[PDB]
From Swiss-Prot, chain A:
Component of the Mediator complex, a coactivator involved in the regulated transcription of nearly all RNA polymerase II-dependent genes. Mediator functions as a bridge to convey information from gene-specific regulatory proteins to the basal RNA polymerase II transcription machinery. Mediator is recruited to promoters by direct interactions with regulatory proteins and serves as a scaffold for the assembly of a functional preinitiation complex with RNA polymerase II and the general transcription factors. Interacts with GATA1. Component of the Mediator complex, which is composed of MED1, MED4, MED6, MED7, MED8, MED9, MED10, MED11, MED12, MED13, MED13L, MED14, MED15, MED16, MED17, MED18, MED19, MED20, MED21, MED22, MED23, MED24, MED25, MED26, MED27, MED29, MED30, MED31, CCNC, CDK8 and CDC2L6/CDK11. The MED12, MED13, CCNC and CDK8 subunits form a distinct module termed the CDK8 module. Mediator containing the CDK8 module is less active than Mediator lacking this module in supporting transcriptional activation. It comes from Homo sapiens. It comes from the Eukaryota. Belongs to the Mediator complex subunit 14 family. It is found in: Nucleus. Signal peptide: none annotated. The chain holds residues 102 to 147 of 1454 of the full protein. This is Mediator of RNA polymerase II transcription subunit 14. Ubiquitous.
From Swiss-Prot, chain B:
It comes from the Eukaryota. The gene is MED21. Component of the Mediator complex, a coactivator involved in the regulated transcription of nearly all RNA polymerase II-dependent genes. Mediator functions as a bridge to convey information from gene-specific regulatory proteins to the basal RNA polymerase II transcription machinery. Mediator is recruited to promoters by direct interactions with regulatory proteins and serves as a scaffold for the assembly of a functional preinitiation complex with RNA polymerase II and the general transcription factors. The chain holds residues 3 to 48 of 144 of the full protein. Interacts with PPARG. Component of the Mediator complex, which is composed of MED1, MED4, MED6, MED7, MED8, MED9, MED10, MED11, MED12, MED13, MED13L, MED14, MED15, MED16, MED17, MED18, MED19, MED20, MED21, MED22, MED23, MED24, MED25, MED26, MED27, MED29, MED30, MED31, CCNC, CDK8 and CDC2L6/CDK11. The MED12, MED13, CCNC and CDK8 subunits form a distinct module termed the CDK8 module. Mediator containing the CDK8 module is less active than Mediator lacking this module in supporting transcriptional activation. Belongs to the Mediator complex subunit 21 family. This is Mediator of RNA polymerase II transcription subunit 21. It is found in: Nucleus.
UniProtKB/Swiss-Prot annotation, chain C:
It comes from the Eukaryota. It comes from Homo sapiens. It is found in: Nucleus. Component of the Mediator complex, a coactivator involved in the regulated transcription of nearly all RNA polymerase II-dependent genes. Mediator functions as a bridge to convey information from gene-specific regulatory proteins to the basal RNA polymerase II transcription machinery. Mediator is recruited to promoters by direct interactions with regulatory proteins and serves as a scaffold for the assembly of a functional preinitiation complex with RNA polymerase II and the general transcription factors. Transmembrane segments: none annotated. Component of the Mediator complex, which is composed of MED1, MED4, MED6, MED7, MED8, MED9, MED10, MED11, MED12, MED13, MED13L, MED14, MED15, MED16, MED17, MED18, MED19, MED20, MED21, MED22, MED23, MED24, MED25, MED26, MED27, MED29, MED30, MED31, CCNC, CDK8 and CDC2L6/CDK11. The MED12, MED13, CCNC and CDK8 subunits form a distinct module termed the CDK8 module. Mediator containing the CDK8 module is less active than Mediator lacking this module in supporting transcriptional activation. Coiled coil: none annotated. The gene is MED19. The chain holds residues 81 to 164 of 244 of the full protein. Belongs to the Mediator complex subunit 19 family. This is Mediator of RNA polymerase II transcription subunit 19.
UniProtKB/Swiss-Prot annotation, chain D:
The chain holds residues 69 to 134 of 135 of the full protein. This is Mediator of RNA polymerase II transcription subunit 10. The lineage of its organism: Eukaryota, Metazoa, Chordata, Craniata, Vertebrata. Coiled coil: none annotated. It is found in: Nucleus. Belongs to the Mediator complex subunit 10 family. Component of the Mediator complex, a coactivator involved in the regulated transcription of nearly all RNA polymerase II-dependent genes. Mediator functions as a bridge to convey information from gene-specific regulatory proteins to the basal RNA polymerase II transcription machinery. Mediator is recruited to promoters by direct interactions with regulatory proteins and serves as a scaffold for the assembly of a functional preinitiation complex with RNA polymerase II and the general transcription factors. Component of the Mediator complex, which is composed of MED1, MED4, MED6, MED7, MED8, MED9, MED10, MED11, MED12, MED13, MED13L, MED14, MED15, MED16, MED17, MED18, MED19, MED20, MED21, MED22, MED23, MED24, MED25, MED26, MED27, MED29, MED30, MED31, CCNC, CDK8 and CDC2L6/CDK11. The MED12, MED13, CCNC and CDK8 subunits form a distinct module termed the CDK8 module. Mediator containing the CDK8 module is less active than Mediator lacking this module in supporting transcriptional activation.
């Protein structure tokens, strides 16, 4: 653990950044799946 | 008479809206800014 | 913009690019003496579990009595079912 | 966790390196994918409505991060 301490600063930074990019990358897909329902559910509601 | 086909056209475009977000998301132009073709990611030409 | 150079990640790239890295922790074990078998089972995740309950160990140290450690006075006897 | 199981923490640094590099293309690739749709579609709106030509030019202007 100590011998690895040289990378203690720039591993969590990329772990969150990668998830953030993954979040938006997948949130858009999860976002898109919602519209398919909205393209019919919302039309029904209107 | 003609407005009956307008609603069909309006709904036809509504169906096409969800199809647009279903294509430009998992695909995309393989830019060389990050040489993504080298590794795990998939491939889809422009 | 190149985020690798913007956030000063190029140095990490030059240190941890494609190279020979052991899949295990055998890059530090050989420096140590004795035959060490990699304890990577589930029972070895204690240290992770030890951090959720700090109160198990009070602030500074547990009570200690050096005189009571006389049990470490050991005779000269053999030891089966144990290899050096 | 990698240390506890005797895994390869250094490989994770490489994994993160491949993780950031590949996913940097995702954010940019998506952006470029949806930026060209912005540029071309706005150009298409400009070729259909003559009386609202100036407005479409504003859509592209507000579609940038100024």
């Amino acid at each position: 653990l100590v011998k690895w301490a040289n990378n203690a600063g720039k591993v969590e930074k990329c772990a969150m950044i990668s998830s953030f990019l993954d979040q938006q990358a997948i949130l858009f897909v999860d976002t898109a799946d919602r519209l398919a329902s909205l393209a019919r559910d919302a039309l029904v509601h209107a | 008479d003609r407005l009956t086909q307008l609603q069909d056209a309006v709904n036809s475009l509504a169906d096409q809206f969800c199809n647009a977000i279903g294509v430009l998301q998992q695909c995309g132009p393989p830019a060389s800014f990050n040489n993504i073709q080298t590794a795990i990611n998939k491939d889809q030409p422009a | 913009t190149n985020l690798i150079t913007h956030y000063n990640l190029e140095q990490a790239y030059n240190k941890f690019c494609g190279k020979k890295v052991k899949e295990k922790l055998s890059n530090f074990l050989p420096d140590l003496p004795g035959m060490i078998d990699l304890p990577g089972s589930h029972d070895n995740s204690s240290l992770r579990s030890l951090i959720e309950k700090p109160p198990i160990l009070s602030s500074s140290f547990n009570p200690i009595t050096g005189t009571m450690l006389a049990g470490f006075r050991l005779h000269t006897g053999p030891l089966p079912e144990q290899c050096r | 966790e990698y240390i506890d199981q005797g895994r390869n923490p250094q490989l994770y640094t490489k994994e993160c390196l491949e993780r950031a590099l590949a996913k940097n293309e995702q954010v940019k690739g998506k952006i470029d994918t949806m930026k060209k749709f912005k540029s071309l579609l706005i150009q298409e709106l400009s070729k259909v409505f003559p009386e609202d030509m100036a407005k479409y030019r504003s859509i592209r202007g507000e579609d940038h991060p100024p």
